[model samples]
Every structure is written in C-alpha cells, then in structure tokens.
Target chain A: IHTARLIHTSDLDQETRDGARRMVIEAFRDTDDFTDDDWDHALGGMHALISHHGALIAHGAVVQRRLMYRGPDGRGHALRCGYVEAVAVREDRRGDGLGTAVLDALEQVIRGAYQIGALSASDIARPMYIARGWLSWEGPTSVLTPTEGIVRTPEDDRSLFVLPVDLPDGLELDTAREITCDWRSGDPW
Target chain B: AIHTARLIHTSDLDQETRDGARRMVIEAFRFTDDDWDHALGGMHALISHHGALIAHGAVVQRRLMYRGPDGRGHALRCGYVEAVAVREDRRGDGLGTAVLDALEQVIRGAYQIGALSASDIARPMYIARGWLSWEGPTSVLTPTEGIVRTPEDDRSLFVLPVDLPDGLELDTAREITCDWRSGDPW
Candidate 1:
C-alpha cells in the first residue's frame, strides 16, 4: 500500500470521499455500532488517506475541537485541540503500516496547528498511541453545557488520551486538573 | 421532472452530495483552500439532475457589527454565502438562480442579512437579484491590533437586507466591521 496524502475536507473529490467513508464504515463494523454522530466527528478537517489503485484502504482525520481549561486564575479559557477521529485500515488490508501512515499524517496536522492532540480509544488500540508518545489524562473530564455550565463526567475520564506537545499559551496540562470540552449533540468526549 | 432544491446543514450532507457540490465549485471558478474552509459548518443548497448533483450554494454564520445612525454598535447575524456554482453543462440555465433561491430563504429565516464577496464577473448577476454593494468603509477586528481598515474588500462586498430591521436606516456609507478569521477576514 502507498503512504498517506492529506486533503482538506471540502477538497475531497467524489471517489475519495465515498471510498473513504465506505472503508471506515466497514472497518469499524460494530455490532457495537457506528452512529451518525461517529461519522460526523471525523469531518471538518484535513483527512489522511492511503489509496491503492484509486481505492482508499486507510483513513484518518484530525478535527478541531475546543476545550475549556482552567488556568492559574481558576477561570476557564478556550483551548484549541486537534481531536483525532475515525482511524481505520481496510480489513483485507490491515496488519501492516497503513494505520501508522495515516496517524503520522494526522500527527503532523496536530503538531503543525493545534495546541494539543486528543482522542479516545479502546485498550486494544491504546498501546499504539502510547508507543507514539501519547499519555492518558489523569484529570477529571467534563462538558460545557449551554445551560448547565461545566459538569463533571466521571465515566469518560478513563478514555481520555492526550499528546500535550504544546500546552496553551501559559497553561500546563496538570493531569489532576479538571478539563471540559464544548457541548455537542453526540458523545461529549 | 425537474430537480427540487434542498436546504440542509453541511453536516448532514452525505459523501456523494458533498463531493458533487465541491466538484461543481472547482469547475465553476477560482476556488482557493481558504474559500473551501469558509464553506464548511453551514447550510447548503443542493440541486441534482437525473440523479446526479449539478448545482450548489451555501451560507455560513458570520457576525458583522454595524454602527447605526446613533453611532452605537449593533451585531447582525450575517448569513455569509460561499462556494456557489452550477455544473458547466447547466450554467446557461437558472441553476445558479435556483441554488440562490433556496439560500435566500435560509438567510430570511435565520439571519438579519445576507452577504457575500463577489467576483467582478459575477457581481452583475447578484445586483440583478436585488443585492446591494456595501459602499461603506470596510474593516476587520484583528486578534492582535483590534480593528484595521481593509480598503480592498470594500469594492467586492455585497449585502441583501433579508430581514434588515425596519427601524434602522440602511447607511451604505457607514463603517462596517467583521470579526477576524483565517484567510480573508472580509
């Protein structure tokens, strides 16, 4: 398989967009389920893909997600996060470096633009990120609700993995501090 | 049967639909990467012909702070249009008009005004649709310096009073300012 090429979301032409979507839809083939929300989370950013004979065999994307972190003043400020989403390789084409190719492209996106990189993954997928230098967030997590304000999300804390390559201007990623992301219709994390 | 125009969120667009729209834009005119980013996260108007996507237009939310007769600042919900195109084979027909017809409805329903940056080649068509060129001083509120003048953007800017407040006079010569954004702030 070839290495990855990045395309801005809107620049993806018909064949690539449809093929990548199909590859991802099948790769995550969950009786466990891939919802509509899951598909949308991957959009609105640069997409990394590996193609064979014009058919996409691997895909990943780094999307911008804003998080609110409390600085030293104990007041929250917005932090730009490069949130990785929908990473997958063709089932028939897996067990190779295609996944790594896409992530390498994705990491370049995160490092080149955002203040931090974040993602949620199953334990099975966590080691790849660890070997790539990502660390789990020991901090409590929460969502900034439109009406309810910042509310703790105890259940999602364990799923948080972060590569804090560049912290917000003056703030550090204090593992024990509370961090919150903007509210959305889908899963808050 | 003729294709019916559909107004939907860009987020709700299926893979083929998004591609169809993008392909049309690429064929229509000079579509820069910045313009593509500006087109996302907004509402879109799609028209398909014989089961294939043919024409497209979209409006995204942008806040424009306008100074009124009283010199007080008023923020307007500006429905900024972007990435409008009709397939090459379908260009002579009203597909362009067809797309904007749906988009104007959205601006009327959800925004105080409609705005766009028009090319010289395309400006006449917009004017024929009752859009007015913004004759005011144009400026952008930058992240570092607060506000700066953009004399270049003034000529290409156009506005439609979709739901423009009746009480406020339309002052074409007044100062209008937009929030700073990536690429072109105007």
Candidate 2:
C-alpha cells in the first residue's frame, strides 16, 4: 500500500526533506554526476512524493524555468516552463509503478501551472518520457555565450525532451529545428 | 560627473527603493514577477546620482555541478547575475557596464564563477568583459525529471571563471548540470 503527497518546498519539514535527499543520493550513488549540489537542486520546488507505510519510496518535483524556442517563422519566444527534477524511487520498491505515480502527480502540477513541461533524460529513462507523450528534440543544441556567440552543444542534441502544455497556436514541434537557450552557470542543456 | 555605486542586500532596501528598482527593470526589459523574485535573496549593485537611482543589478549564490575532464564530479559556488538594468535616459553613460563591473568584482572575490543568462542586447558588454559562452551540455537535476537538458537555455548562458588554481581547467566541453530552482533553472 502507498500514499502520494504533493507539497511545496516550504511545507516540508527538515526531516522529510533530509529523507528525500538521502534517498536521491543513495539512488544515484553509482552515478558519478550525482552530488550534494544535485540534491540541493531538487529543493525549492513543489515535490511529488510517494510513501509506503510511512517511509518515503518515490519522489519528484516540478520547478519553474524559462524555455526559449524558435517558432517555424524563425522568431524566438520564451515559454514559462515546468521543469521536472530529482526523481528517485527506493531500491526495493522499483518497478511497482511508484515512479509513474510520482511523475503523474508532478505532471498534473505542470499542466496546471506552466506553458510546457520539460526534462533531461538519460538513455535508461528516455523510454518512459516518450511513453508519456514527451517529444524528444532532434535539433542542434546551442548556448548564447557572452563571448563566444552561439556555441553548439552537440552532446545534448538527442537527449532533450519536452511536453507542451498550452503552447501558443501555430508553434508546432519541429524536431529538426534548432533551439537556443539562455545562459546560466552550469550546463546550458 | 561622478556616479556612486552601492552594494546593498536586497533586504536592506526600503520599499520605495525596491519599487523604484523594479519599475526601472520593467521599463528596461520584459520581465515577470518570477524574474523579479530571482533577483532577490542576493546582493544588489545600485548606481545612483544625487538621490536618483540610475542603474541596478544583483548577484545570487548558486551551486553548479559538473564533471571534470578526468570524469570526476565537482560542485562550485557560482555568482549568478540577474535583473541588470540601466535607467532609460542614462543609457549612454556606460552605467550598465559599470554596474556589472561592480557585481563581477563581488563574484570574483567570493565565487568560483560569475554567470548570467544574457539577452542579445546585453551580450556584447559581457563578452567584452571576458565572459565566455559555456560550450557544454546544460542539464538540471530534477526530482521527477532526472537530469534533463535545457536546450532553450543553452545559448544564452555565459560564464566568467574567477580565481583558479594552476593546471585546473573548467572542462567546458563536458556536461555541466545546475541545481534546480523555482524559476529559470539556467
């Protein structure tokens, strides 16, 4: 038996937050990229958590972001994006649909609040995003650098995905088209 | 003519002063409440002359996680710039650059990297100051989403490396991921 809860970051007590962070760190223990900072990124957003018998089993959050896209007309637009982050399920409870349940709750939040839903997927997780109607971006990925102009991130080309929600009319997904993103400290996507 | 630039915490600002700064930003750029919210909880660089606010910007601390060329993961304290704007009538006086110069000084002294999401109109000033475009894969560590790529934010993110030890390279070609936040993960 499982219970799912959706709560904002402020509503989560320190103990619950720590438990969730500990769960993520353990879940991605083998992945070299997972760090304390990665866990920090998962906070400050609305979380979708599933607990079995009072122990947290699965978790996720939908944070806000600005997604810039090029329409077919060659113009640029910024969309308020609901970005999914820090999703993890406990080891013993894998494949019991808990992950899906957490995601379903998060998606409901996204649909209600954002213009689009987006996430970066690993090869292992790609199938699930696609199965949920998320379209993989097939365009050249690039960043607007302060000094270098537009720099292409070819490594991220096929891994980016998005789920449109209330996208303005006439802006259809064109997989082959290129997309540009705003600058930030770390990965430009 | 001399202009004074003051570094003030957002919490220190009086309501009228904060409202003044917000109005300046809204007039200078297309911004939303979320954008304004991101600018808070950080230090602000305010340039004023004779009691009139003319320029404004802020820097917030952000944690950036990335892999090195050696394939090891590292996290750095990043000074993320936001809400930079100069008064409309004060455009030609280079107040914008001056405000950023002050902010960059704070960033260099306290953080490993100085970063911001640059608009096309403001990109030249940053580039001229030696900031570089990050040429790596940008992803966010999401709860339900996992490590998701933010392709739309890729091209607009710029960075300046602060003090670094010898033989330490940023490995910009490798993938770099940011900690998630409520707005504009980039």
Candidate 3:
C-alpha cells in the first residue's frame, strides 16, 4: 500500500467515488448481514478515505449536523461538526500506521471545517485517536432507535470523543434548528 | 436481460439515487430522518473537504447494457460504483470509466494498493471488474455487540493492486475495546 492523498468532496473524480463506494461495500460485506439497502444506509455519509497511491485503504466522514451540548436557553445548538462515521483499513495493511495517517488527514479536514470532531472509536483505534488529541465527551454517546426515538444506554465497546474547535474568531454555534446539511451553510466540518 | 447503466457523482446523483441510498439505509439500521441526512452530510463534507484534489464528479452512472432490436437501449444498469471523492472535478465525459481506467493505468505503471469491504451481492461486481479480494486478518470491535471479533472468514478483506504514490505503504490495523474511564494499548 502507498500513502494516499486526501481528496475533497467537491474535488473527487468518478473513479475515486466508485472506488470509495466499492471499498465500503466490501468492508461491510464480510458480516453478510446488511442488504443492498443496508449497505446504502450504512454508507450514507462518508467523507474521506486513504488511498495507497490509487487504492482506498481507510475511509471516514464527519457528521454535518449534530445536537451539541444543549444551551441554557432551553434550546439545543446544532453543532456543525465532523464525525468519523465509517473507517476501514485494508486487511493486509492493518498495523502499518495507515489508520493513524488516515485519522491525521481526516482531523485536518475536520479542523479546517472549524467544527468539533467526534467518533465512536473502536477499541482498536481509540488509543491512536486519543494520543493525537481526541478526548472522550462528558458522557458516552448513545443512539435512539429511529421509530421509538428513545436514547439507548451507552455501550462500553466504542469511545466517543470530541475535539473542540474554539475558533480563533470566537465563533459560537447557533440553535440546532438553523443547522444546514451542507458545510457551506453550517459551520466547518 | 440487459440492465440500465448510468454513472453519477455524489453531487450529480439525482433525487432517485439519494432516495435509493436512503431507502437502502433505512432497511439496515435504526436511525431517524435527521440521522440519515447527517450521515449523508458527513459524506458530503468529506467530499467538500477534498473534491479539489481529484476533479469534477457525479454519483450516478446511467448506461445501456446494449442496443435493442429497435435501436433502443436495453437493460439499463445504474452504475452505483462507489469510491473516494476527488479533490477537483476533472473536465471530461465518461469520467467514471475514465477514473477507473486512469487509476488502473496508474497501477499498471507502479506499485499501488486498494481495498474495501463488500456485500455478497457486490462481490461479483468487484471480481468481474478485476478488483482482487484481500487475503489477511481483520479485527473488529463492535461497540453495540461488545466483543472484539475477528472476521472468521477469508473473504472479509479485499484489495486490488495499483501504482501507489510516493512515500506510501500498507500497514496492519487492529481493533481494541475502549471507554472513557480507561484505555488500552495497541
């Protein structure tokens, strides 16, 4: 594998796009559980991937709209931030620093967006991320079942952390409802 | 029977593909409409962050399997081929094929590697396209499942050979369980 260059969404060519889509499908296929629709949803929002020269090694994306810590105004602020939703390293190249390199590249993108970065780091990559400055949130993050909308208990398996953006310009997030789905409309990342 | 084929980028993808991707996602997991957009937005953010390096792109690739008796197209296969977004859009038609050909051409000239996960239905497409499955061990830590499980099958990992860029090489990765109160070492 070769060190891959980081490409932007607006910049990627069709090959890069196809490679990413294929790579992700392969990564999730091993479980043999998700359907075509499942794969599509599982791969809903991906941001970046590490390509060794041309092959994709690891891929991830940041959540564009998320409810950050609620403010005292009895309202929640949609923190425009990035979350590493999906990441996969090639099987053969698992321990060769590709994951870390990918993370570094991804953080650069997130930090550039000026949005706090968050991810549910698996046990395998948690240390790699933490060593690079990602820290755990005040509490574990949980997901609510779509239909029920009930928050589930935080699992101990993955660690969720945030890297504060503390923009030099003193930019603070507005209310959650104003959040736009795109980077241009919302804060960076 | 022939299939309808069309190529598109994440940006150029029509409401149908977006809805298709969304409907496909809804079938697999527990998430809300808000979660769906956030997830899709993450991908958009990734592309926005790096679309410049590559070139102009689209998500949908619609094409004809072949010409029918009446000169009409037969078997329209929508090429939902997925890959990384480029840094910039390269100006050209047939860019999707161009991308694959160009990348493959690069692989032919130098040492390169590519890899990704796939579903059973997608395996044939990759194999037919000449992308090789990776032979190695994959470690996964499912937070929801609470177990550090290695993919017990050989089909878990897949890779394709290509010319790698300068100063790049493949490395192995492992998954470990971690939490706020304590952490583990690699």
Candidate 4:
C-alpha cells in the first residue's frame, strides 16, 4: 500500500529529508549528474513524498520562482510560477506508475496555488512529462542576471516544459516570446 | 478593512507577503536566526488586513522522543509551533488568538502532540488558549551526550496532547527528550 504526504521543505525533519534526498539522488546517481545546488534547488517549497509501508519510494518538490513576461501592451508581469524540480522514484519501483503518482500530487498544487507551472525535464524523463500534458516550451528561454539583463539560454530551449493551463489570457506559450526566469546561484532552469 | 485569515504553506508566500511576515515576526520577537529556521516548512496562519499581513504564527513538524513505560523511547511526530507574532499596533486585538486557533486546527489530526515554547510576549496568548502545561523533565537527544535533563526549559514548554500512543503516559513527569536542533531545545 502506498501513502502520500505533501510537506513543506522546512517542516520535514532531518530523517525524512535525508531519506527522501537520498532516494532521489540515488535514483539519478548513474545516468544523471546531480550536484548539491540541484538538491538545494529542490527545497524551499512543498514536497511530494510517496512512501510504501513507511519507506520513501518516490520524491518531488515544487518551489516558487518568477517567470517574467510582457503583455501585448508591453506591461511587465512577474508571473508567480510553481517550478517543479528533483522528481525521482526508486529504481526498482520504476515502470509502476510511481513517478506518475508523484506528478499527480505536484500538479494539483501547481494548479491550485500558482499562476503557472514549469519544469526542465531530463532526456530519460521527458516522455512521461510530455504524455502528462506539460508542453515543451517552444519559446526562447532566458534568465535575468544581476550583471546583465535577459541572458538567452538556447540550451534549455526544448528541454523545458510549461503547464498550458491558467496562464494570463492572450499570453501565448509556443511563440518567439522569451520566457525569462529570475537568476539563481545554480543551474538557471 | 476586511481582515482575512489564510493558512498558507511557507513556500506559497509571495515575496511581498514573505517580507511583511518577516517584518512582523522580527518586530515582535527581536527575531534571531533560530526563530527564522523554526517557522519554515510548515503552515503559516496569517491574519492579513486587505492583503497585508498583520498577525502570524507557524506550525512545524519535529520528531520528539517520548519515553514509554517499557523503558524504550518512541519518536512521536510532533507539531512544534513557532514565531507567533503580531504587529505592535495590532496588539490587544484578537489577532494573536486567531492565528493560534488556526494552528491548532491544522495540527489537530495530523500531529500526535501540538507544542510551543512560549516567549514572554507569547505566554499570555498561549496561556489564554489553555494549552496543557508540560511539567515533565525536558532533555535533548544530543549527538555527543546521551539524553541530559534541562530543568529550566520545563517552565515555558507547553504541549497539547492530540493522539498519544496507548502505552504513552503523557501526564507523568518522565523525561521528554527532543531531537537535537541548533538553537534552543525545549
């Protein structure tokens, strides 16, 4: 039997935090490169923990970030976006829809709480995200830097996905528009 | 002015609201680093007037070691309330009790015991709420030392028994050990 708990990053005691962190990192240990900042980026928000019989099996977190956009009238809107990060399931628990269950919980939060939802999907995890209706952001990706303004990140072009619902009306996603995120210390996704 | 009480996750606070909440907490508590850390990762009971936060409190989960009659300690999932603060001008109003009630509602079913260490400023509101006194000896599960009792903490420490285990004796004065944290351990 599986159980789900949506806990804030701060509310998670050391044991569960470490347990979930280890589970996610171990899941991506071989195929993907994970650094400390990646884990840091995963925190400071709500987390979805999928446990079976009190053992953590899958983990994911959603942190708030700003996605800058300009309306047709050229008015700046710092959209309150729920950015998903660090989603991973136990290797043995793979192909059992555990990952999907994790996203189901996270997306519900994204839908109810924020203006929009977004995530950068790894190659191996891309298909599942796509099948779940998170569209690849065809628009250009960029970040607002401290020293410079609106730096383009073409590398993230197709890898980034955005939830298509609840966007400010007339704000198109699949366009030449630049989807800029606030600069952070780690990988700017 | 319409006053709204919204219970929100710490992460869901937008920048402006976050800044206001921090200001309210700092002003009320002469806030410290440990105070800031304790308020995160939990729900914030915010009483805002027309979108600006006026009164705030937080409930965070911590694992507490409750000694059983079998001479073993069981880790009880505890809801530790922290950073209960109201704006100076907002004092003498019902805002403080409003947020505490909201915190209790959140921890009622989800936590085994709801607890908070009352500051001189917070003691009145907590006392007024009728939170049960924790008269038992308090100790911390420190890494270097085994559990050591700290008698001074028993003064301000308070708890609300929600769903204690069958074998647990909450009323007894047995030593209650807390998981080691950086700052004040009670």
Best prediction by DockQ? 1
* Candidate closest to the true structure, highest lDDT: 1
Residue-level lDDT tens digits of model 3 in B91-177: 233333444543333223221243444556557766777876544344322222322434354344445644332333332332211
Instruction: Please give, for residues B77-110, the per-residue lDDT of candidate 4 as tens digits.
Output: 5778888888888888778778888888767735
Q: Which ten residues in a row have the lowest lDDT in candidate 4 chain B?
A: B140-149
Which candidate leads the pack in TM-score?
A: 4
Kindly indicate the candidate among 1 and 2 with the higher DockQ.
Answer: 1
lDDT of 1 by residue, B47-161 (tens): 8777877888887655566877886555565778888888777877888788888888767655568898876777888999999988788887543345678866324888988
Count clashing residue pairs per candidate. 0, 27, 112, 2
Sort every candidate by TM-score, greatest first.
Answer: 4, 1, 2, 3
Off by over 4 Å in 4: A1-3, A156-158, A169-175, B1-7, B10-43, B46-90, B93-186
Question: Candidate 3: misplaced stretches above 4 Å?
Answer: A1-3, A8-14, A28-46, A71-75, A138-140, A144-150, A153-156, A167-189, B1-186
Ranking by lDDT: 1, 4, 2, 3
Error at B167, model 1, angstroms: 32
Score residue B80 of candidate 2 by CA lDDT: 82
DockQ score of each predicted structure, in the order shown: 0.04, 0.04, 0.04, 0.03
Q: Is candidate 1 or candidate 3 better by DockQ?
A: 1
Per-candidate local distance difference test: 0.72, 0.71, 0.41, 0.72
Q: Hey, what RMSD does candidate 2 come out at?
A: 11.9
Pairs that collide in candidate 4 are A10-B41, A11-B41
